[PDB]
PDB file of C-alpha atoms in Angstrom:
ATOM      1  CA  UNK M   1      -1.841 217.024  77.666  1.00 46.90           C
ATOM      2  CA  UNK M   2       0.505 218.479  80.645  1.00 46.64           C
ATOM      3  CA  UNK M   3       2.790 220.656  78.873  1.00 45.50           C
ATOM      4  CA  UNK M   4       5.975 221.041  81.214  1.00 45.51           C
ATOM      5  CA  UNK M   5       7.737 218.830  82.484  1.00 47.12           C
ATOM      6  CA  UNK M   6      11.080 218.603  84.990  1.00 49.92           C
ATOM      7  CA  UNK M   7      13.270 219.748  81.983  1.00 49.29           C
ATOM      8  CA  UNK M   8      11.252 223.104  81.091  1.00 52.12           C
ATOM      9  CA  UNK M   9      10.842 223.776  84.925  1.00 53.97           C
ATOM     10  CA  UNK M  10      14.540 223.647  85.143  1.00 54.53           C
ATOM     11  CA  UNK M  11      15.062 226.246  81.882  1.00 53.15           C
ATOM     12  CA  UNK M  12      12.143 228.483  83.986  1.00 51.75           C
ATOM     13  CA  UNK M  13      14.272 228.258  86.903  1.00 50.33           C
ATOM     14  CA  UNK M  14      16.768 229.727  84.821  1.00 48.80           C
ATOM     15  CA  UNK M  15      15.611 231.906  83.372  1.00 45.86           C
ATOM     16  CA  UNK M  16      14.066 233.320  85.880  1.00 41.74           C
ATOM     17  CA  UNK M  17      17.281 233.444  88.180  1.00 40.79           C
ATOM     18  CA  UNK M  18      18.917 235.267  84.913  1.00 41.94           C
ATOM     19  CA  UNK M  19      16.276 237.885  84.737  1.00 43.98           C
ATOM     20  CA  UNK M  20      16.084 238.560  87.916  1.00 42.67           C
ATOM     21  CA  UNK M  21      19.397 238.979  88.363  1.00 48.39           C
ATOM     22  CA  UNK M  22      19.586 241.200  84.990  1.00 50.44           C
ATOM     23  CA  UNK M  23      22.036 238.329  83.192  1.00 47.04           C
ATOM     24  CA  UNK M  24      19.626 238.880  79.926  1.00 49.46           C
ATOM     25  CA  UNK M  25      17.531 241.602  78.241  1.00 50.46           C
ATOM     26  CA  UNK M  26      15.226 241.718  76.241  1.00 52.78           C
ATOM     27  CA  UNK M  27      15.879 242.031  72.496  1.00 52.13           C
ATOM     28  CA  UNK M  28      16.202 245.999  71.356  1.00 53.22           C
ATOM     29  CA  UNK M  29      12.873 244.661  68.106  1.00 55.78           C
ATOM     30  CA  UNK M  30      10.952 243.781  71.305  1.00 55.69           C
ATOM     31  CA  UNK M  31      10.898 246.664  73.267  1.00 56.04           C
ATOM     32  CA  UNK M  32       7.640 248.379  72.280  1.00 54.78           C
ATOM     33  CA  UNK M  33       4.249 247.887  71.573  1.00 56.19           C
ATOM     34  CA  UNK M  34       2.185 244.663  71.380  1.00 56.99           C
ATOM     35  CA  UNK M  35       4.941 242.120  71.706  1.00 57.32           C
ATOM     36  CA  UNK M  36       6.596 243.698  74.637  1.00 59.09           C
ATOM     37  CA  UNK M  37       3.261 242.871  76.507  1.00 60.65           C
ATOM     38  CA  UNK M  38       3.991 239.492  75.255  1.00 60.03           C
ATOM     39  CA  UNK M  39       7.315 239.515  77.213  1.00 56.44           C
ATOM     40  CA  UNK M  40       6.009 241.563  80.191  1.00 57.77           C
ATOM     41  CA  UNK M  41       3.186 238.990  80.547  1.00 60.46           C
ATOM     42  CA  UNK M  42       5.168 236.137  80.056  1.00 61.64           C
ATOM     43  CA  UNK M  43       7.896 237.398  82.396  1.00 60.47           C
ATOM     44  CA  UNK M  44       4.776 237.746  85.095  1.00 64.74           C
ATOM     45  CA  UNK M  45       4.239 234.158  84.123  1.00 65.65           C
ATOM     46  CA  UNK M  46       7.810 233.275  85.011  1.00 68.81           C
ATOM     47  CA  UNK M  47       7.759 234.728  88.367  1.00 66.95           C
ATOM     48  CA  UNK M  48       3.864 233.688  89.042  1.00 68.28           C
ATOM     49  CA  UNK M  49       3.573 230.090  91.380  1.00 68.82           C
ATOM     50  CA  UNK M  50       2.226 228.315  88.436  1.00 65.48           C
ATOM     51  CA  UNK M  51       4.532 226.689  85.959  1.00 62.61           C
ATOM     52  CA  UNK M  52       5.132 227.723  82.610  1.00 61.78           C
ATOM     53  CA  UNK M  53       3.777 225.370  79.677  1.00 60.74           C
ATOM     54  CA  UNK M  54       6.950 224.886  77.277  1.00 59.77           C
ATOM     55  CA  UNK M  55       5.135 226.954  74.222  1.00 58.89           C
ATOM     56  CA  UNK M  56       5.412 230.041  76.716  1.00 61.42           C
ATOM     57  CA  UNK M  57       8.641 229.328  77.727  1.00 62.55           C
ATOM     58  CA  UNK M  58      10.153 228.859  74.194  1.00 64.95           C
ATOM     59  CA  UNK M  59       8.494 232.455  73.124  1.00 64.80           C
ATOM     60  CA  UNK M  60       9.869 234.133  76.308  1.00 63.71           C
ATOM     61  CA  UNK M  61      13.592 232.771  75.860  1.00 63.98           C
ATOM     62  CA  UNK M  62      13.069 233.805  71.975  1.00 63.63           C
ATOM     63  CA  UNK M  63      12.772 237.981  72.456  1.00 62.41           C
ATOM     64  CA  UNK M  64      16.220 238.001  74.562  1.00 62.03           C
ATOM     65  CA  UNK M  65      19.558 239.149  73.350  1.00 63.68           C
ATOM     66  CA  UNK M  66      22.427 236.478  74.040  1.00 59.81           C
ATOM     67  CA  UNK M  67      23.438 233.430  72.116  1.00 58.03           C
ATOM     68  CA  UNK M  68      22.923 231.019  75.157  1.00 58.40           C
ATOM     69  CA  UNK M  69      18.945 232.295  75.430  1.00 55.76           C
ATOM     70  CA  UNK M  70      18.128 231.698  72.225  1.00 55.39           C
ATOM     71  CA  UNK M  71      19.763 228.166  71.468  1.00 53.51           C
ATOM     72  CA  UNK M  72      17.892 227.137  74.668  1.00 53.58           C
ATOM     73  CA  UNK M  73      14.678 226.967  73.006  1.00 55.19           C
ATOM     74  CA  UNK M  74      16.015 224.752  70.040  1.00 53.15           C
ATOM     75  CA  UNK M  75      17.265 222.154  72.600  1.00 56.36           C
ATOM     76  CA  UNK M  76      13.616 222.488  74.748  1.00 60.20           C
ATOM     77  CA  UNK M  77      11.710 221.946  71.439  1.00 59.16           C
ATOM     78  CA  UNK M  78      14.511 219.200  70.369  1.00 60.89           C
ATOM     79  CA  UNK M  79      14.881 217.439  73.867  1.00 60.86           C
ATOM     80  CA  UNK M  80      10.810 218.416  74.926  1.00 61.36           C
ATOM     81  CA  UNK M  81       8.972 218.692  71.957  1.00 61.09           C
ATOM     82  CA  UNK M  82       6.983 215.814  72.562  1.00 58.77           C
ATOM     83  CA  UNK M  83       5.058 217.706  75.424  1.00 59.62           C
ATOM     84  CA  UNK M  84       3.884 219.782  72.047  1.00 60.68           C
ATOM     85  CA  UNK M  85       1.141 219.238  69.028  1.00 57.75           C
ATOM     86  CA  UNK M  86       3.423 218.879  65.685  1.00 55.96           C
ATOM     87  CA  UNK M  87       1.936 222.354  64.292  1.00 54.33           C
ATOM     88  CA  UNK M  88       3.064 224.544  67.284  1.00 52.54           C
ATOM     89  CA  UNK M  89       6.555 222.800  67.657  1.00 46.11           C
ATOM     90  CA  UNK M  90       6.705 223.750  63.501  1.00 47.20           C
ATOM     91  CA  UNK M  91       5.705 227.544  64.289  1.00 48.89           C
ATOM     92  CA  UNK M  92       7.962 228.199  67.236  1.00 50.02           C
ATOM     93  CA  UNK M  93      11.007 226.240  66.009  1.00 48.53           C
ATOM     94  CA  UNK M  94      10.262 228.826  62.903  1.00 49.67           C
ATOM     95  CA  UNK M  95       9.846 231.558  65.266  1.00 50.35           C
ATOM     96  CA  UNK M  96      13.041 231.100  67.149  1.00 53.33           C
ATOM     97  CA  UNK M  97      15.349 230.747  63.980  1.00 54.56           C
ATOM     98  CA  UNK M  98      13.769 233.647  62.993  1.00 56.27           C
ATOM     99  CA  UNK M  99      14.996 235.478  65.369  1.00 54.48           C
ATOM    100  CA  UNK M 100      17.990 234.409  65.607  1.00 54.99           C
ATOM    101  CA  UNK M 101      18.492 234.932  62.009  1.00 53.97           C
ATOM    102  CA  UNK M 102      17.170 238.522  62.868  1.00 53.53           C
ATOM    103  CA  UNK M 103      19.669 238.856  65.619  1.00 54.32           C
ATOM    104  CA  UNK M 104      22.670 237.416  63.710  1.00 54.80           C
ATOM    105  CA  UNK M 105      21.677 239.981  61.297  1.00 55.65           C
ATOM    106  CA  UNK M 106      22.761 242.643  63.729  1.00 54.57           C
ATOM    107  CA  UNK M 107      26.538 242.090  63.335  1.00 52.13           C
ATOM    108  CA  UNK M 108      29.125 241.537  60.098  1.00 54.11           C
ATOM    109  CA  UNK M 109      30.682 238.623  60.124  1.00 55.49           C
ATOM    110  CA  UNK M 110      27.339 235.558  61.248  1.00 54.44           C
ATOM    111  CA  UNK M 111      28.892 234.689  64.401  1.00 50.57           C
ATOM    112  CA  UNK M 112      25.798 234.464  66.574  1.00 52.05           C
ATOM    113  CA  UNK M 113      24.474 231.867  64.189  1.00 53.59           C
ATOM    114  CA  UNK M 114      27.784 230.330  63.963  1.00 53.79           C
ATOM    115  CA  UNK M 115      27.847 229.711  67.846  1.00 52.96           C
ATOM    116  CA  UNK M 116      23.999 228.361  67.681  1.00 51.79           C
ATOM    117  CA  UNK M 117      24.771 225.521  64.766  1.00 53.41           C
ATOM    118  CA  UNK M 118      27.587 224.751  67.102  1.00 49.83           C
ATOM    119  CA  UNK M 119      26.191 224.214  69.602  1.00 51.31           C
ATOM    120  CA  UNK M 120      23.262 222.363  68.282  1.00 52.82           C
ATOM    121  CA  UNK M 121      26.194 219.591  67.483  1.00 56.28           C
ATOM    122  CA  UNK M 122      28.354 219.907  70.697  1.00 55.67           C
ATOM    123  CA  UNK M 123      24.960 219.091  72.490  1.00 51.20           C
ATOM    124  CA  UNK M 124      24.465 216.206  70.390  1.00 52.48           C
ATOM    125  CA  UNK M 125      21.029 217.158  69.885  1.00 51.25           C
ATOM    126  CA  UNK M 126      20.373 215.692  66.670  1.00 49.77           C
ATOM    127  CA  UNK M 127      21.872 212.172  68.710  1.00 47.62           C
ATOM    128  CA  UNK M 128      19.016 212.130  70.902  1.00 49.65           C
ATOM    129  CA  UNK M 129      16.133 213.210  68.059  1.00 49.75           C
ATOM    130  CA  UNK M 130      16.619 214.205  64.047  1.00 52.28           C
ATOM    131  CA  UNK M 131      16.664 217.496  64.562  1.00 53.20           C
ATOM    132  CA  UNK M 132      15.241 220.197  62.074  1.00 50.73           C
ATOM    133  CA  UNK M 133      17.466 222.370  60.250  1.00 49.73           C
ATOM    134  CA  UNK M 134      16.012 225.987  59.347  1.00 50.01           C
ATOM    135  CA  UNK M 135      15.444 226.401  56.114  1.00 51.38           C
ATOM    136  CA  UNK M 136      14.337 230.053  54.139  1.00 54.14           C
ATOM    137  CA  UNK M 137      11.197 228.353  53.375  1.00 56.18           C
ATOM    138  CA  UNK M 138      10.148 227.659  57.039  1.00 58.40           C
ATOM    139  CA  UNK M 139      11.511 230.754  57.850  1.00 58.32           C
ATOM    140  CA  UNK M 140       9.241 232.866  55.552  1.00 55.36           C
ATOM    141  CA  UNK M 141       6.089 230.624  55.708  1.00 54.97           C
ATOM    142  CA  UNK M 142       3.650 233.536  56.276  1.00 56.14           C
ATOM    143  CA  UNK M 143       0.918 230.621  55.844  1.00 55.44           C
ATOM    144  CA  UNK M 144       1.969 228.976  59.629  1.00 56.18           C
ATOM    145  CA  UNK M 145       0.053 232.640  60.981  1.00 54.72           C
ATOM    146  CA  UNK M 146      -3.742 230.920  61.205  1.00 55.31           C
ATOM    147  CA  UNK M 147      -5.932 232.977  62.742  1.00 51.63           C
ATOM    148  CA  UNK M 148      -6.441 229.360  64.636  1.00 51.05           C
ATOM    149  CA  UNK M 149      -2.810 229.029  65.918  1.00 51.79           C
ATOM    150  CA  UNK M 150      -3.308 233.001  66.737  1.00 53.54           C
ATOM    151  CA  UNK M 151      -6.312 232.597  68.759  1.00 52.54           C
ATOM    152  CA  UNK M 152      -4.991 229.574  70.555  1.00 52.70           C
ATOM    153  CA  UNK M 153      -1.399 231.211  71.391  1.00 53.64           C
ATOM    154  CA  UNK M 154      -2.451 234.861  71.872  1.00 52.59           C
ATOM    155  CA  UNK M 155      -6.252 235.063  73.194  1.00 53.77           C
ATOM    156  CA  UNK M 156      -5.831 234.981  76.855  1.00 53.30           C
ATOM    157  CA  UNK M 157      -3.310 237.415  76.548  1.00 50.42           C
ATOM    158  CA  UNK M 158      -4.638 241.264  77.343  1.00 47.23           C
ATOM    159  CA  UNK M 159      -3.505 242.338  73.937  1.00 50.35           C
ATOM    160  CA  UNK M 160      -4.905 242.670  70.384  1.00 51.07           C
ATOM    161  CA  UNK M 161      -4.104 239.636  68.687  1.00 51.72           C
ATOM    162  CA  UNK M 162      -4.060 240.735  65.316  1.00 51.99           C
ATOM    163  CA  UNK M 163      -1.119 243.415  66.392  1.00 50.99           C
ATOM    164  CA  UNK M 164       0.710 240.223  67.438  1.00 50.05           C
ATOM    165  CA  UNK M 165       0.144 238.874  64.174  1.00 49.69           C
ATOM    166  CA  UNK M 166       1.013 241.692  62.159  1.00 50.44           C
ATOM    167  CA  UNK M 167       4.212 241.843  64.442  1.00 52.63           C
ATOM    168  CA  UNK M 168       4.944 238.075  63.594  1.00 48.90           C
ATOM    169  CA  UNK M 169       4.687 238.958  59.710  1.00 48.64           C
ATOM    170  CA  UNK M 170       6.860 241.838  59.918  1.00 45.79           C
ATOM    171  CA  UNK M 171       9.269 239.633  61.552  1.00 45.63           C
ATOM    172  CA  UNK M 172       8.677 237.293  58.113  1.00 48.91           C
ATOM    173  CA  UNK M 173       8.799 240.317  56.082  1.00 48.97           C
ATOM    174  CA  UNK M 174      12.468 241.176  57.108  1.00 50.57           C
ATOM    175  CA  UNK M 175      13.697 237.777  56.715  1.00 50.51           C
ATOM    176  CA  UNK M 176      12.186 237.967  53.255  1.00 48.22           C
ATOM    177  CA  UNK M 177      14.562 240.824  52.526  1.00 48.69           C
ATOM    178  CA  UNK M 178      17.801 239.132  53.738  1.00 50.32           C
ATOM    179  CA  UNK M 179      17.784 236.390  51.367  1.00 50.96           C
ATOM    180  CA  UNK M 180      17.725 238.820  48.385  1.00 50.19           C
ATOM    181  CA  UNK M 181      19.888 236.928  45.850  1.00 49.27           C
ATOM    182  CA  UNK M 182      19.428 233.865  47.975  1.00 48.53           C
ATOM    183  CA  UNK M 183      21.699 235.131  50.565  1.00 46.35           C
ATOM    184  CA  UNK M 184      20.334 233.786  53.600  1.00 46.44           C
ATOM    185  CA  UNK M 185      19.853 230.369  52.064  1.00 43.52           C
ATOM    186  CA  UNK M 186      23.651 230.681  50.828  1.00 41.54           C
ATOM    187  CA  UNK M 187      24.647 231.601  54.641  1.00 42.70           C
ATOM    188  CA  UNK M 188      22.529 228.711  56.502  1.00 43.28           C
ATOM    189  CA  UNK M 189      23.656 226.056  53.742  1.00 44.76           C
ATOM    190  CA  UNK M 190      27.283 227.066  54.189  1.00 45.26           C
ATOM    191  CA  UNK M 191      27.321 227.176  58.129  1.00 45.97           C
ATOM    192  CA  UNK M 192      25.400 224.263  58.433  1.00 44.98           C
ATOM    193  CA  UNK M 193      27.822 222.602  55.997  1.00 43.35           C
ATOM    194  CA  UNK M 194      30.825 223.614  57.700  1.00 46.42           C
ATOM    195  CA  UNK M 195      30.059 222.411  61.295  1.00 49.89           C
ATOM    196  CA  UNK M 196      28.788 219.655  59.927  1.00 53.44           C
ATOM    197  CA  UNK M 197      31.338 218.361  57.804  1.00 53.65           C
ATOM    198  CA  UNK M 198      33.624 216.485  59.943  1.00 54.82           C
ATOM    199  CA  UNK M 199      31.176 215.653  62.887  1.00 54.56           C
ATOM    200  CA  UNK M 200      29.743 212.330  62.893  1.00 55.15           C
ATOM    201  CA  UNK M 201      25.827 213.115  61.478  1.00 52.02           C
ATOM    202  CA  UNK M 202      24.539 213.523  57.854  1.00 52.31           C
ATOM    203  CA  UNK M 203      22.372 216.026  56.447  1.00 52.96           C
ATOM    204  CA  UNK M 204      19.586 214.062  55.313  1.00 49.24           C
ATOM    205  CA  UNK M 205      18.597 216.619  52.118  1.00 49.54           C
ATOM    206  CA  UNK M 206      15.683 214.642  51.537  1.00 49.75           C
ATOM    207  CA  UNK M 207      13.843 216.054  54.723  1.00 51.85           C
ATOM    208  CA  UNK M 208      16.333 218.774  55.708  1.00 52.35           C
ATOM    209  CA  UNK M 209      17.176 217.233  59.002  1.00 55.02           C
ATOM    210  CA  UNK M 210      20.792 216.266  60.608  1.00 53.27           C
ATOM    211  CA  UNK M 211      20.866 212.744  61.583  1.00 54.00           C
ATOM    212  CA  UNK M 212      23.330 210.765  63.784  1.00 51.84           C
ATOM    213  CA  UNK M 213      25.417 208.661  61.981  1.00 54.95           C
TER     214      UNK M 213
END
């Protein structure tokens, strides 16, 4: 199944025109090691002739540094998601809230994720599909790491899978530690909540999705 389509070539275009032009950065937890390969292959990738399936472009936008990068890959996997099997749209969607949490970490206050649930709802994505709200429990699945999806993802990369994987759980690890006393499940309820409250969609609690109303 093709996995692009005139959407993602447009976010590669981008992208691409951002990087080169140094608009973006790469994310200070990224700069080392394993998973900067990632990103150094994947920005090859970008600038290569041959078009960049959406899973790759969703895991390149997810290591940068600004807001605008990483809601981008929520509205791909929203808007594009179909060009994906369910259990890799579950993984990165998981993977790019992650990080975003992660980021949003970085400063008092939780504007970052403030500005990304916005956004989410100015863009009327959940209009156009249900969209899935993150949720602590998505966030921490260690269980979504399969050495399958690993294999799959990772193995045509030059790099030692299991480093990416151990990268990926240290990610999990951290996010573990912010919701101590619930905290993080307090501060995505409450956001969530608050953008939503007045807009015209209801959290459907039953699946943890936003739906149109």
């Amino acid at each position: 199944k093709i996995q692009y389509n005139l959407d993602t070539i447009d976010a590669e275009k981008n992208i691409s025109n951002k990087l080169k032009k140094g608009e973006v950065q790469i994310c200070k937890r990224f700069k080392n090691g394993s998973i900067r390969e990632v990103f150094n292959i994947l920005v090859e990738e970008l600038k290569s002739t041959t078009v960049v399936n959406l899973s790759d472009l969703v895991e390149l936008y997810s290591m940068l540094d600004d807001e605008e990068s990483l809601f981008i890959p929520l509205r791909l996997l929203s808007v594009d998601g179909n060009l994906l099997n369910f259990e890799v749209k579950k993984f990165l969607n998981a993977l790019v809230w992650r990080r975003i949490v992660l980021l949003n970490a970085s400063n008092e206050g939780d504007k970052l994720l403030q500005h990304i649930v916005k956004r989410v709802f100015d863009e009327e994505l959940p209009k156009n599909n249900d969209f899935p709200l993150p949720s602590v429990d998505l966030l921490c699945d260690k269980s979504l790491l399969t050495p399958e999806y690993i294999s799959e993802t990772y193995g045509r990369f030059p790099i030692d899978q299991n480093a990416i994987r151990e990268e990926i759980y240290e990610e999990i690890s951290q996010v573990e530690t912010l919701n101590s006393d619930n905290s993080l499940e307090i501060k995505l309820h409450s956001t969530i909540g608050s953008v939503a409250k007045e807009k015209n969609y209801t959290i459907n609690y039953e699946t943890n999705t936003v739906e149109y109303e």
